[PDB]
Amino acid sequence: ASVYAWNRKRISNCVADYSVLYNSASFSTFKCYGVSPTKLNDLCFTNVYA
């Protein structure tokens, strides 16, 4: 999507494998605020918003 029309998806009722994101390494910037950036983000979340 374009910047102004930011598209929002709700990630609900599924298990997540955050480690493909971490080990992919092709992501230029993977900065995490409030949640750990050392691949420790594998925690129970009520709501996940992309």
Added chain:
Amino acid sequence: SALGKLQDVVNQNAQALNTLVKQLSSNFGAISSVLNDILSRLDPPEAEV
């Protein structure tokens, strides 16, 4: 309320302990009042702060 002095003493002690337990559950200018979530939601260097 004939034994009000002893009741006041035990009430003050109970209030002090309750206040201590309540202060235990305090953000204290952090992100959360629980430390295990800090350990799980931050790497060790950032978490130390």
